[PDB]
Amino acid sequence: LATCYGPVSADVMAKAENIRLLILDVDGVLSDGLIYMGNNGEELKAFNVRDGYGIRCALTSDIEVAIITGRKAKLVEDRCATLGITHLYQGQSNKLIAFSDLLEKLAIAPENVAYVGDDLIDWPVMEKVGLSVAVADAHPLLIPRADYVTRIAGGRGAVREVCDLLLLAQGKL
Amino acid sequence: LATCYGPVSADVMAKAENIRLLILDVDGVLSDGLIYMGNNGEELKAFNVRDGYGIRCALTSDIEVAIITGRKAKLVEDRCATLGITHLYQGQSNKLIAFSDLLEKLAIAPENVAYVGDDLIDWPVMEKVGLSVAVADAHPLLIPRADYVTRIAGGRGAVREVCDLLLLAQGKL
Amino acid sequence: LATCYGPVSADVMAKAENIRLLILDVDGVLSDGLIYMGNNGEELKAFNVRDGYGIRCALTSDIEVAIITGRKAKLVEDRCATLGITHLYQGQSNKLIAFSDLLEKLAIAPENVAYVGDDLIDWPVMEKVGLSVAVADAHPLLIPRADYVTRIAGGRGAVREVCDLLLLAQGKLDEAKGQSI
Amino acid sequence: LATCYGPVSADVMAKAENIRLLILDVDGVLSDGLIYMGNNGEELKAFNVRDGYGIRCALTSDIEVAIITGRKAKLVEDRCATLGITHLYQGQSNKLIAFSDLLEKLAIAPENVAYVGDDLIDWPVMEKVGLSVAVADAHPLLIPRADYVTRIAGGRGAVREVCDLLLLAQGKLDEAKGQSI
Amino acid sequence: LATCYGPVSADVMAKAENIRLLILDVDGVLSDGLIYMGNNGEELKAFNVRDGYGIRCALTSDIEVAIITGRKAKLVEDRCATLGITHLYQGQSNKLIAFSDLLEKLAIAPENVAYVGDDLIDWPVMEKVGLSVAVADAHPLLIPRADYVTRIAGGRGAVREVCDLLLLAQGKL
Amino acid sequence: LATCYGPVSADVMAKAENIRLLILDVDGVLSDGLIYMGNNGEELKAFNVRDGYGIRCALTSDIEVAIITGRKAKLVEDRCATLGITHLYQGQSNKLIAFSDLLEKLAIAPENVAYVGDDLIDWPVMEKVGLSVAVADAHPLLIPRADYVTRIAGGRGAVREVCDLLLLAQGKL
Amino acid sequence: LATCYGPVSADVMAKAENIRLLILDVDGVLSDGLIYMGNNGEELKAFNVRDGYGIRCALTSDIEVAIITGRKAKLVEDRCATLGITHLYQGQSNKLIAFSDLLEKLAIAPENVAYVGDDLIDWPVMEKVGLSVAVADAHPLLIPRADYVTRIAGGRGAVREVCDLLLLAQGKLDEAKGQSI
Amino acid sequence: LATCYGPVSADVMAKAENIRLLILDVDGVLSDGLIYMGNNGEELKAFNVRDGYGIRCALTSDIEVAIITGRKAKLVEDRCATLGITHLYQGQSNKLIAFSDLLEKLAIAPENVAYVGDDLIDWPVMEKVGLSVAVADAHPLLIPRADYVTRIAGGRGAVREVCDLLLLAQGKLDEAKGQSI
Ligand SMILES: [Cl-]
Ligand SMILES: [Cl-]
Ligand SMILES: [Cl-]
Ligand SMILES: [Cl-]
Ligand SMILES: [Mg+2]
Ligand SMILES: [Mg+2]
Ligand SMILES: [Mg+2]
Ligand SMILES: [Mg+2]
Ligand SMILES: [Mg+2]
Ligand SMILES: [Mg+2]
Ligand SMILES: [Mg+2]
Ligand SMILES: [Mg+2]
């Protein structure tokens, strides 16, 4: 099937067509993979504005969005609030426990879930979902495992690319 | 016509020659597309210094500059103040409402307006203006719609490239 | 407006939808612009098989194909024979002459013609047609003049990309059949 | 799973482990897709010596090699002779015919076959085999269909990369011997 | 030997197999080589999250990690605390003085040490260790001196690449 | 002549041999061309650590270093303090006035001065000096005017490249 | 000054404005540096048609063209005949000899001459002329010596780029006419 | 340790300083690895003129040059004749045989020999010499084994880069003279 990032397989489009929940890793997926730290204890992360638009589009097109994080951080809470993401698990790590809880609370089967990751810690959940996605510049060992590898790098619009894929697959782009 | 970024078409040069108002998107055009967020509620964006010089040159060469934004932010107000941009619409529901108001207030026809964007939300106004510009690394669906696609990426000097184009077209470079 | 090479404009797709004749330059469009010459007067030129597949798809999908080239070589006649191309004009640098001949011979309006070029010599014809195309690595002064600039370079599948575009625009891409020769 | 070209999936490695016959397209796979033509009817094609080394390694490591190509040229018979390839089908664009012939002649199940292609004409056979491979610079519509996309371009060592993959999967890479010819 | 970043020499793999202590330069190795400075005296540096995971893996796989720095900075102390790095020398004149001290305190021979650097100041210690590593975008004069040059740039996952190499060599990846 | 960044002309090496004062533009030369602005009035710029080492090497090898700036900023003052740069002209812009003053105060001829710039505003002074340098990613109209165009981009080590060139030329690298 | 390949210096433009004779190396300048050799003593070289267009534009715009090469091959004579080049020196590695001959034959001062080279053998003549040019992919030791370094590689349109530069400098670019052969 | 291609290690420079014999593979080192084949049994190979210049510089600067190649073709004899190479071994895939012959014929210790290769077949000889070199685009499994990896690709000036390295290491680069043929 034709996409604005290049051809995708029929299998990936079919997986995309059925997604009701999009789970997004933060570091290296929503961000550039960096953490900015300062001498007064400041901590910043950089998110991508066009990803934000994609997320808002998904949320208004009957695709739930969730984030699972290993450490509570106000900046992540603030980003979720800005975007309307209400499913945020923090201080977890481990992703399976939150994944299982999320699926129970939403009554959504794993085949109807997509997950976008950049590192090996993402694989246990990615292995279980309907559409697993590695970002273009993910850890090299993750890349061949995923159903779809984005064209765009983490923090640069990989998430927008996935939102665009789901919306296209579902006739909502 | 010859430019320091490579050839442009006669049609683009002719459009550029007539521009009295340059409207600039912020995120992904003036910036690198990122938003830096911190755990104390800090918010930063990165602007490009050579873009600033271009904007000052435009403003002193009888080309008005305006910005239309979806959310009031002191950092954008400050950037405008530094550069001498006085036409700033913030917290805007869309872009057409501010566009229409701007054109009435300035008594300038749409053909004498340029707009530089990076995403689909920019297209409704871009469709109406004399010179529409997509930055080099804009969303892929926007790129083919624009009159001119910059060589330089958002936040890296795309805006300077557009200012340089207008000034060259108008014999002011 | 998605294509397998990237997005195209609505305007380019609409122009492509109307094409009944695809005219190609040879050197720099069907080849990468090289002319091979030997000490015994031998000459070679290299063509790309995936362009051959595109040309066969076009020819079998109601899109005629013609060639207008400034050089003259029997090898080009042979290439046309392989591909079933029956409209070849060689030794012609004033390409408007051949263009006028084709409009008459094929009873076709210029808006229903596409032309793929790489150098300034191609512009007089490109200016007149419904869909003008510059290959990705065309002369820098030709590039901004064309309706569509290919993603793929001359000799490397620019012609295939144009064939794919016409077929897609005309709803013929999925069912098109060619030989990659 | 580590290779000298980058990680591959467990699925691709498992498919590779089972290959007893490697089928190759010629133009765009064993070459970069160019056909050289001259004024006296001469034709040349270019092959890559490191692909030759891979093919020799495969043939001496209990992996048979066959070629199915839409063009027909004596020069291809000569290249096969250099490399010891004894299964050549030329002038065939309906590649399923030659494929069926090979399955019978070599008494082999399709799951034990790999096919390396670059254009849509290759897909009907690729669809049926155990390991389908598109070269790095294959037609964009073929790329997403294949089990494995090579890192290296057609004519530049894509075939060598596939030979190396099969040998690695089968525990034969370290001890394989070839000639880089 | 095969690695997920490409082939490495037998000699480099053999050096990697024996590493009990990994010493990491900060600027241009753990970071992007930048220092972010503000008008209120703010100072930030950007670390890479996937590097952090590599470091944690090394530390839980019997490979000690140390950092030697030329200026005490809370942000570096905080990064070390987050990752479990306890060997941090700051405000250092040399790197050799800290290196010597570290090896005495840990009773580890230089052949069992790896060092990852990006500039000429790193060379005196790199010259002495078992596995010297220059990052991909290190100063050009350092690159040919090192046993191994990473594929990944400083701040982008060069450190993760080295951790992955050590763990692979030691059968722990 | 041979350099670690590639060949340079005999003319450029000869100009470099005679440099007693190196003048550095800040934005797009010492920095990445960005200015980071926040909603509490924060302003950050990013400097390159390896450039800092080059500057210290120049200063200890009888090459004075100066900076001329268009706006007083504590972050620039702090960077200069860290590096031992004592010739800092701020709130200037033009650059000729400071240049002339600097040369009078130091009793140095223009032929013994190098200047590294990235934009057209740098050209009037660059035109007068012994060794004019445009960074790799300077404004396109500046590039052909300079005696030397660096291989490395602004904020990424262009300044270190120039320091390395001067030191090599003077037999001090 | 803006050019279609990027900005050039005022000094280069002023040098270009004064050129009445353009001297070209062959291998690595008019070609990508390859020499094709066969088992029967055949030899081929490849030239670029867009360079042909530039040469035709120059020759018809009062800029003479000459070639000085270290090799000797009839095929080079044939290429000169195609393009109307009437000043060819082959088998000459001490290129100062041919250069002196040209200055006398064409009654021209060295400042009115341009030379395009790719290797150190070209430098003795380049040192003497008004505009010296190294192609983009010239030997690294030649590159810093030249007045202008082309953006385009040898054999790929470096010569065209130089022709375009001279014509632009002389106010002849828009009206120049060539054949892309 | 600065070179015109980038920095080299002190160890590589010291190895280069001692070289009296430079041995070259052909396919993939002196060429980009392609073999051109025709329907009448024609064969072509392409060599690079700047490599020719380096070889002439080496030969006139007390560095002998030899070739050991797995293929056999008269065209290679002709190339050696052009360049003054008098030590050619063709049809040889067990390259240790030719290597031993050279050591005896030239009364030379292996530490005074350099070898430039591109595939695994070259490794047995490379393992024994004072300076082993893999070209930039050598097979990925060869690259980490070599003392020096060239910056320039096979057929594109990797051999010239090695010649330049030896000459620089021996204080002969400035004064070296060649022909770019
Ligand atoms: Cl033509
Ligand atoms: Cl075929
Ligand atoms: Cl020559
Ligand atoms: Cl061989
Ligand atoms: Mg992550
Ligand atoms: Mg935007
Ligand atoms: Mg042409
Ligand atoms: Mg094919
Ligand atoms: Mg450092
Ligand atoms: Mg600046
Ligand atoms: Mg030459
Ligand atoms: Mg070889």
Q: Please give, one letter per residue, the 3-state secondary structure of chain H.
A: CCCCCCCCCHHHHHHHHCCCEEEECCCCCCCCCEEEEECCCCEEEEEEHHHHHHHHHHHCCCCEEEEECCCCCHHHHHHHHHHCCCCEECCCCCHHHHHHHHHHHCCCCHHHEEEEECCHHHHHHHCCCCEEEECCCCCCCCHHHCCEECCCCCCCCHHHHHHHHHHHHCCCCCCCCCCCC
Using the 8-state DSSP alphabet, how is residue B153 labeled? P
Parallel/antiparallel/unpaired status of strands G88-89 and B21-24: unpaired
Using the 8-state DSSP alphabet, how is residue D138 labeled? S
- Report the distance separating Cα G67 and Cα G87, nearest Å: 6
Distance D34 CA to ligand 2 centre (A): 12
Burial grade of F170 (CB within 10 A; 0-12, 13-18, 19 or more) = middle
**Side chain identity, residue A140:** P
CB-CB neighbours of E160 under 10 Å: 25
Burial grade of E86 (CB within 10 A; 0-12, 13-18, 19 or more) = exposed
What residues have a C-beta under 5 A from ligand 6, the ion?
A: B 25, 27-28, 118-119
Burial grade of C37 (CB within 10 A; 0-12, 13-18, 19 or more) = buried
> Which ranges constitute the DSSP H helices of B29-157?
49-59, 74-83, 96-106, 123-126
- Report the distance separating Cα B92 and Cα D181, nearest Å: 68
Radius of gyration of chain D (CA): 15
Q: Any binding-site annotation on F49?
A: yes
- Report the distance separating Cα H71 and Cα H166, nearest Å: 27
- Report the distance separating Cα D7 and Cα H135, nearest Å: 23
CA G98 to chain centre: 15
**Mutating which of F12, F145, F150 best tests the G interface, going by the most G Cβ atoms within 10 A?**
F145
**Distance from the C37 Cα atom to the nearest Cα atom in chain G, whole angstroms:** 5
Q: Exposure pattern of F82-105 as b/e (b: 16+ CB <10 Å)?
A: ebebebbbbebeebeebbeebbee
- Report the distance separating Cα C66 and Cα C22, nearest Å: 6
Tokens standing for B170? 């108008």
- Report the distance separating Cα A169 and Cα A164, nearest Å: 8
Closest ligand (CA of G91): 3
Closest CA to H26 of H82, H92, H84: H92
Helix (H) / strand (E) element for E54: namely: helix E49-59
The DSSP code sequence of B104-138 is: HHHT--GGGEEEEESSGGGHHHHTTSSEEEE-TTS
Of E6, E9, E140, the CB nearest to H6: E140
Radius of gyration of chain A (CA): 15
CB A113 within 8 Å of CB A103: yes
Closest ligand (CA of G67): 3
3-state SS assignment for residue D118: coil
Distance C70 CA to ligand 1 centre (A): 4
Phi first, then psi, for residue G38 (nearest 5°) are -120, 170
Resolution (in Å) of the shown entry? 1.4
> ∠E144-F159-B5 over CA atoms, to 5°?
100
Sheet harboring G131-134: ordered strands across?
G88-89, G64-68, G21-24, G113-117, G131-134, G148-149
Closest CA to C34 of F117, G31, H140: G31
Burial grade of F61 (CB within 10 A; 0-12, 13-18, 19 or more) = middle
Closest CA to F160 of F61, F14, F48: F48
CATH number of D1-181: 3.40.50.1000
**Chain H residues close to E140, C-beta within 8 Å:** 6-7
| CA dihedral sign, ordered E68, E72, E78, E84 | positive
CA E106 to chain centre: 17
- Report the distance separating Cα C157 and Cα D140, nearest Å: 11
Q: Exposure pattern of A62-96 as b/e (b: 16+ CB <10 Å)?
A: ebbbbbbbbeebebbbbbbeebebebbbbebeebe
**Distance from the F75 Cα atom to the nearest Cα atom in chain E, whole angstroms:** 5
In angstroms, what CA-CA distances link H175 with E15, G132, H17, H114?
42, 22, 16, 22
Q: Which residues are G21's β-sheet partners? A: G64, G113
Touch between D and E (at least 3 CB pairs under 8 Å): yes
**Distance from the C1 Cα atom to the nearest Cα atom in chain B, whole angstroms:** 9
**Distance from the C93 Cα atom to the nearest Cα atom in chain D, whole angstroms:** 21
| Contact yes or no for E53 and A119 at CB 8 A | yes
Helix (H) / strand (E) element for A146: namely: none
> ∠C18-C24-C25 over CA atoms, to 5°?
150
Closest ligand (CA of D49): 12
**Distance from the F6 Cα atom to the nearest Cα atom in chain H, whole angstroms:** 6
Tokens standing for B64? 């008005």
**Mutating which of B1, B4, B151, B165 best tests the G interface, going by the most G Cβ atoms within 10 A?**
B4
Touch between F and C (at least 3 CB pairs under 8 Å): no
Give the contacts of G96 (CB within 8 A, at least 6 positions apart). G124, G125
Helix (H) / strand (E) element for A107: namely: none
The DSSP code sequence of G33-69 is: SEEEEETTS-EEEEEEHHHHHHHHHHHTTT-EEEEE-
Q: Give the length of chain H.
A: 181
Burial grade of E6 (CB within 10 A; 0-12, 13-18, 19 or more) = middle
Q: Any binding-site annotation on D119?
A: no
**Distance from the C170 Cα atom to the nearest Cα atom in chain A, whole angstroms:** 16
- Tell me which residue has tokens 């650097």: E117
- Report the distance separating Cα B168 and Cα E95, nearest Å: 54
Q: Exposure pattern of B54-64 as b/e (b: 16+ CB <10 Å)?
A: bbbbbbeeebb
CB B123 within 8 Å of CB B30: no
- Report the distance separating Cα D161 and Cα D163, nearest Å: 6
Among left, alpha and beta (phi > 0; psi -120 to 50; other), residue E19 is beta
Using the 8-state DSSP alphabet, how is residue B30 labeled? I
CB E68 within 8 Å of CB E27: no
Using the 8-state DSSP alphabet, how is residue E31 labeled? B
Closest CA to F58 of F23, F27, F109, F106: F23
**Side chain identity, residue B157:** G
3-state SS assignment for residue A123: helix
- Tell me which residue has tokens 């900076």: F67
In angstroms, what CA-CA distances link G155 with F168, G32, G106?
36, 4, 27
Closest CA to A161 of A125, A133, A141: A133
Distance E154 CA to ligand 9 centre (A): 9
Q: Which residues are D1's β-sheet partners? A: none
CB A35 within 8 Å of CB A27: yes
- Experimental determination technique: X-ray
Distance G72 CA to ligand 3 centre (A): 10
CB A114 within 8 Å of CB A131: yes
- Tell me which residue has tokens 């011979």: C105
Touch between F and G (at least 3 CB pairs under 8 Å): yes
Q: How far apart are the first and last CA of chain D?
A: 30
- Report the distance separating Cα H117 and Cα H137, nearest Å: 10
Of F37, F41, F139, the CB nearest to B50: F139
CATH number of E1-173: 3.40.50.1000
Parallel/antiparallel/unpaired status of strands F21-24 and F34-38: unpaired
> Which ranges constitute the DSSP H helices of G32-157?
49-59, 74-83, 95-105, 123-126
Burial grade of C105 (CB within 10 A; 0-12, 13-18, 19 or more) = exposed
What are H's interface residues with D at a Cβ cutoff of 8 A?
25, 27-28, 33-42, 44, 70-71, 93, 118-122, 139-141
CB E149 within 8 Å of CB E12: no
- Report the distance separating Cα G150 and Cα G12, nearest Å: 12
Chain A residue with minimum CA distance to E74: A39
3-state SS assignment for residue C149: strand
Closest CA to H122 of H27, H36, H20, H14: H27
CB-CB neighbours of E91 under 10 Å: 10
CB E81 within 8 Å of CB A41: no
CB G31 within 8 Å of CB G110: no
Of C50, C155, C179, the CB nearest to D139: C50
- Report the distance separating Cα B149 and Cα B144, nearest Å: 8
Q: Any binding-site annotation on G50?
A: yes
Helix (H) / strand (E) element for F74: namely: helix F74-83
Q: Any binding-site annotation on D160?
A: no
CB D136 within 8 Å of CB D152: yes
Q: How many helices, marked H, and strands, marked E, lie in chain F?
A: 6, 8
CB A64 within 8 Å of CB A21: yes
What residues have a C-beta under 5 A from ligand 10, the ion?
A: F 25, 27-28, 118-119
